From Swiss-Prot, chain A:
Organism: Thermus thermophilus (strain ATCC 27634 / DSM 579 / HB8)
PTM annotation (3-methylthioaspartic acid): residues: D88
The protein's name in its UniProt record: Small ribosomal subunit protein uS12
Quaternary structure and partners: Part of the 30S ribosomal subunit. Contacts proteins S8 and S17. Interacts with IF1 in the 30S initiation complex.
Higher taxonomy: Bacteria, Thermotogati, Deinococcota, Deinococci, Thermales
One cellular component (GO) term of this entry: small ribosomal subunit
Key words of the record: Methylation, Ribonucleoprotein, Ribosomal protein, RNA-binding, rRNA-binding, tRNA-binding
UniProtKB/Swiss-Prot annotation, chain B:
CDD domains the UniProt entry points to: S4 (cd00165)
Gene: rpsD
GO molecular function: metal ion binding; rRNA binding; structural constituent of ribosome
Cofactors: Zn(2+); [4Fe-4S] cluster
Protein name stated in the entry: Small ribosomal subunit protein uS4
Species for this entry: Thermus thermophilus (strain ATCC 27634 / DSM 579 / HB8)
Cofactor binding, per record: Binds 1 zinc ion per subunit. In a number of structures (e.g. 4Y4O, 5FDV) a 4Fe-4S cluster is seen in place of the zinc cofactor.
Curated annotation (Swiss-Prot), chain C:
Localisation: Cytoplasm
Catalytic function, reaction form: adenosine(1518)/adenosine(1519) in 16S rRNA + 4 S-adenosyl-L-methionine = N(6)-dimethyladenosine(1518)/N(6)-dimethyladenosine(1519) in 16S rRNA + 4 S-adenosyl-L-homocysteine + 4 H(+)
Name of the molecule in the record: Ribosomal RNA small subunit methyltransferase A
Chief subcellular location: cytoplasm
Organism: Bacillus subtilis (strain 168)
Function: Specifically dimethylates two adjacent adenosines (A1518 and A1519) in the loop of a conserved hairpin near the 3'-end of 16S rRNA in the 30S particle. May play a critical role in biogenesis of 30S subunits.
Top EC category: transferase
Record key words, sorted: Cytoplasm, Methyltransferase, RNA-binding, rRNA processing, S-adenosyl-L-methionine, Transferase
Curated annotation (Swiss-Prot), chain D:
Domain notes: The N-terminal domain interacts with the head of the 30S subunit; the C-terminal domain interacts with the body and contacts protein S4. The interaction surface between S4 and S5 is involved in control of translational fidelity.
Organism field: Thermus thermophilus (strain ATCC 27634 / DSM 579 / HB8)
Known role: With S4 and S12 plays an important role in translational accuracy.
UniProt GO MF annotations: rRNA binding; structural constituent of ribosome
Quaternary assembly: Part of the 30S ribosomal subunit. Contacts proteins S4 and S8.
BP-aspect Gene Ontology terms: translation
Protein family membership: Belongs to the universal ribosomal protein uS5 family.
Protein name in the entry: Small ribosomal subunit protein uS5
Keywords: Ribonucleoprotein, Ribosomal protein, RNA-binding, rRNA-binding
Family matches, as InterPro entries: Ribosomal_Su5_D2-typ_SF, Ribosomal_uS5, Ribosomal_uS5_bac-type, Ribosomal_uS5_C, Ribosomal_uS5_N, Ribosomal_uS5_N_CS, Ribsml_uS5_D2-typ_fold_subgr
Note: Is positioned such that it could physically interact with spectinomycin.
UniProt cross-references to PANTHER family, sorted A to Z: MITOCHONDRIAL RIBOSOMAL PROTEIN S5
Annotated S5 DRBM domain residues: 2-65
Length: 124, 208, 261, 150
RNA sequence: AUGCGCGCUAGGUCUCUGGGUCUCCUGGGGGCCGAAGCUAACGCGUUAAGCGCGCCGCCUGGGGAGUACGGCCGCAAGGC
RNA sequence: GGAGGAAGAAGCCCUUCGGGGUGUAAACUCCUGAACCCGGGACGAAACCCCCGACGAGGGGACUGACGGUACCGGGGUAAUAGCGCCGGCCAACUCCGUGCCAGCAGCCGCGGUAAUACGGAGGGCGCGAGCGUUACCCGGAUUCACUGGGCGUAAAGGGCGUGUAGGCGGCCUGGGGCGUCCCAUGUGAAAGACCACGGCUCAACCGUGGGGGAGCGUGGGAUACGCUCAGGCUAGACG
């Protein structure tokens, strides 16, 4: 453009887009699980992925991924929802924090314990 | 806090003789005259060509581990040096060499910086006739660093400073062995120091 | 990279078509090829099972090579020499030693009193002045005493760090030891002589008297004896010990053992 | 006699009648850390031959750099193809602040303190060529005065 | 698949149409090779996609989509 | 915790069954003396008031401490918490078992079907360390709204074409004005914050005392090259 055009019309600023609408500008949310289901990956991967349909304190009901080896989530268990998106599963864009409300830290973890929240194993 | 634990393993990993232990790292025991390869199961294997980042990180780690100060404190000192006048390298090394524990090690009251730190902390050192018990105290050109009167009867200090007879102190320092005291003449230079470190790598590291 | 350095090592070792040589840790056989080309019958003490095929393939076109599957330390090399070099005149030793077992190897070889002509080895510069030095050299020690007692030694070649394919951490020095026909000084109590040497260099900063008195179980008992002996022998304990030599040590050892052994 | 560096080895392929034929390209800088730099690109059926050819080319194509106090006399901006290189003098005690390719090139030049930046395309080959040209396009006070006044 | 106006930067060749002292010089228009230069390349190159200046109109990943909605214009299809 | 401390303890891991690593690391000798105990013990507070001066200026005398028996000093005196993430390329950090597109991992590229440095666990290594990671939001990298500093023949992007209003831009030679523009002086640009220097807390964070600096805008003075404007002229643009 010309300097005259820049004066007249200017430049339009690029606005960011949120990847986590249901959080509503919060680090986490507290929700209730309604459906606990296993689903199928998108294309090259084949597995059964644990997914919980969580209704939040927001005006939202979304699917969240359950990470670890095994869980104890029923159809009422109060859960914490965290940011993060699964590359494969088509529609999940949230995770679950382990060992917070009703979700419990996955058993016999020894390496990455902050994630998959488990207490330090006592040893004598 | 600091790094407490095995030391000559750092000598090995860095691939240089870092005099971190006192007298052992002179005698044929420094574990650099035996096994000069890095520690662990895959120490004595063939070394791949290192990255630019690897080279810079190794140089910075070596320089930091010489003085045994925190990475946070190291960064703070670098940020202070980069903000002053003159060549960043020279100023940074000057600032590193002005630490009280390091000055005590240079004077000869202690054999290792890990020992000078203990001497300073536990209180056997005065600056300008006043007790200071912090290793991080910065001395300026023209302070008297002495051993406290209450600490002059210690075996450790006597053995340390008696051995300094027939031994020379750095040009940027003066000593009084019989008087058990020392004087800080001025800030040291690049060439006054026998560091196996090229400070250019350290400068280039903290730009990433 | 090792293209001509090996040739220089072999040249300094001074091998010919009639001399026998001993190889330790051959690996591939970089030195072994040159040794076979220049010297008479050779011998090797490889212990690595993985590199054995490579060594075999390397030394396939050679007929004057013998390979042994014994560790140098464990194997009594006297029988090795009496069996292999049954016609040869001079038996030398050439090897590149792997850092850790470098001093043990040399000590074991020397303490067994072999009819070896000498030794030529490649080790690190670090422990190279430590086994070829003089009074007040800052490298004087027990190792220096042992090596310069058993044999006559001097450093020959300084291979810098920037020669090897994977860049090592230490400069290297090839050292040649010409073995000595008779021990430099006569000591009846050789063992306690060695312990005395290690006692005078337990700590290199303290004075000799304090070193000697503080490093013997009987040191407390014979404080006066130690003092008088060091005084009479014209080499006092008021010095450090790094300023002494083989001769002073011999005289002092005689002083101690003639009177308390 | 000089020092050598390896900017990149890459493997290219062309289709044939039932199969693929491979070739290797190497980008090599040869310098003396004194103000003489060469840059070669070699293609060969094998990696060692590629390195050899690149070394030979770099030796046969050398440029003298006018360094004062281990830095550049003046700022420069050079575009090669779609790629662009910017070089800028720095006071002693800065260090070569640059990406992999420039850095490699400038270290062997004896340059100690430069501020750089790459714009547009970032093809390493094109960046190398752009940097090399930019080095070739440096004049000092003496040269400028000689051209102007005489 | 190339907005308009102006100035500057080797040439050669083929045509259409004027004036001249008509061997050939001098204007305008339509093509083809090509200096310098440009371009990611193809290619463009005094009829520039070169070197510059002034003003206008557009572009900001692919689908969703010229879609839905609101507005205006039309008899309608439909158009912006 | 510090110094010394084996050609190298034990256990655990790997092994070419020789050994290698954890590793001077430990154990072990000596040395120091966090915590703890005893005694002392603050700065922050000199005024109002009172006596002599006038009911003034000076001078002189007392009271008052939540923090708090805290800081701190002196004297004794004990070896006296290490975790967290990562180790396929980005990006510093490699092996052995378990599993066999399963369980899972994942920021991207992607890894998981029998020999997995990419999942799980061990040994080891790397980075930081009273902390280390994760999620959310902002600037950077992003020359990816391009004033600095991008483009539109075919990658997205020349309006279907004219005529023309507001607007933007504008040939040469002189003279007036001094609007833009530039310069000098001055007022303002508060205190904090930012920069420099010097000091007080045993250093630092923190705080104090100084010195500058500053975009912008008023007031006064100055310059007229270039934009602006007024007056005169010219013919190379345009028009007849
Ligand atoms: Zn060491």
């Amino acid at each position: 453009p010309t300097i005259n055009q820049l004066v007249r019309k200017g430049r339009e600023k690029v606005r960011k887009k949120s990847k986590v609408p249901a959080l509503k500008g919060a680090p986490f949310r507290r929700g209730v699980c309604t459906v606990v289901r296993t689903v199928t990956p998108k294309k090259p991967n084949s597995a059964l992925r644990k997914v919980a349909k969580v209704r939040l304190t927001s005006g939202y009901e979304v699917t969240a991924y359950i990470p670890g080896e095994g869980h104890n989530l029923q159809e009422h268990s109060v859960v914490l929802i965290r940011g993060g998106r699964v590359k494969d599963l088509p529609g999940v864009r949230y995770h679950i924090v382990r060992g917070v409300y009703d979700a419990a830290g996955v058993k016999d973890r020894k390496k990455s314990r902050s994630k998959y929240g488990t207490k330090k194993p006592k040893e004598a | 806090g600091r790094y407490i634990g095995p030391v000559c393993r750092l000598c090995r990993r860095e691939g240089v003789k870092l005099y971190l232990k006192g007298e052992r790292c002179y005698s044929p025991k420094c574990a650099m005259e035996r096994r000069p390869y890095p520690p662990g199961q895959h120490g004595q294997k063939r070394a791949r060509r290192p990255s630019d980042y690897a080279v810079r990180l190794r140089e910075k780690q070596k320089l930091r581990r010489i003085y045994g100060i925190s990475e946070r404190q190291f960064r703070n000192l670098f940020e202070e040096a980069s903000k002053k006048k003159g060549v960043t390298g020279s100023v940074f090394l000057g600032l590193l060499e002005s630490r009280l524990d390091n000055v005590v090690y240079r004077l000869g009251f202690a054999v290792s910086r890990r020992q000078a730190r203990q001497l300073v902390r536990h209180g056997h050192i005065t600056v300008n006739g006043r007790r200071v018990d912090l290793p991080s105290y910065r001395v300026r050109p023209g302070d008297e660093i002495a051993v406290a009167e209450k600490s002059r009867n210690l075996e450790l200090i006597r053995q340390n400073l008696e051995a300094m007879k027939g031994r020379k102190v750095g040009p940027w320092l003066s000593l009084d062995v019989e008087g058990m005291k020392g004087k800080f003449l001025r800030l040291p230079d690049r060439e006054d120091l026998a560091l196996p470190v090229n400070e250019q790598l350290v400068i280039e590291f903290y730009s990433r | 990279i090792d293209t001509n350095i090996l040739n220089r090592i072999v040249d300094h070792a001074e091998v010919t078509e009639k001399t026998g040589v001993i190889e330790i840790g051959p690996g591939i056989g970089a030195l072994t090829e040159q040794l076979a080309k220049r010297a008479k019958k050779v011998v090797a003490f490889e212990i690595d099972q993985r590199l054995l095929p490579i060594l075999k393939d390397t030394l396939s076109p050679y007929e004057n090579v013998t390979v042994i599957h014994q560790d140098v330390l464990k194997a009594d090399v006297k029988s090795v020499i009496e069996e292999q070099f049954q016609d040869c005149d001079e038996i030398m030793v050439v090897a590149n030693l792997p850092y850790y077992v470098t001093t043990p190897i040399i000590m074991k070889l020397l303490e067994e009193h072999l009819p070896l002509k000498g030794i030529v080895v490649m080790l690190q510069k670090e422990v190279a002045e430590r086994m070829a030095a003089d009074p007040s050299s800052k490298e004087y020690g027990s190792l220096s005493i042992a090596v310069q007692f058993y044999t006559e030694a001097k450093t020959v070649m300084i291979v810098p760090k920037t020669v090897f394919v994977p860049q090592p951490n230490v400069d290297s020095a090839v050292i040649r030891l010409i073995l000595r026909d008779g021990p430099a000084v006569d000591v009846e109590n050789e063992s306690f002589f060695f312990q005395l040497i290690k006692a005078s260099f337990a700590q290199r900063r303290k004075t000799l008297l304090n070193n000697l008195v503080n490093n013997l179980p009987e040191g407390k008992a014979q404080k006066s004896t130690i003092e008088q002996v060091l005084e009479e022998t014209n080499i006092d304990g008021k010095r450090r010990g790094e300023s002494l030599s083989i001769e002073e040590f011999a005289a002092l050892s005689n002083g101690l053992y003639k009177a308390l052994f | 006699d000089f020092e050598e560096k390896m900017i990149l080895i890459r493997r290219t392929a062309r289709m044939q009648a039932g199969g693929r034929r491979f070739r290797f390209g190497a980008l090599v800088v040869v310098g003396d850390r004194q103000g003489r730099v060469g840059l070669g690109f070699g293609k060969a059926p094998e990696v060692p031959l590629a390195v050899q050819k690149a070394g030979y080319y770099a030796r046969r194509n050398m440029v003298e750099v006018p360094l004062q106090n281990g830095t550049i006399p003046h700022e420069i901006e050079v575009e090669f193809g779609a790629s662009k290189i910017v070089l800028k003098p720095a006071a002693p005690g800065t260090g070569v602040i640059a990406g992999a390719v420039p850095r490699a090139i400038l270290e062997l030049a004896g340059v100690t303190d430069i501020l750089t930046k790459e714009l547009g395309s970032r093809n390493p080959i094109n960046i190398a060529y752009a940097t090399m040209e930019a080095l070739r396009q440096l004049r000092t006070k003496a040269d400028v005065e000689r051209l102007r006044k005489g």
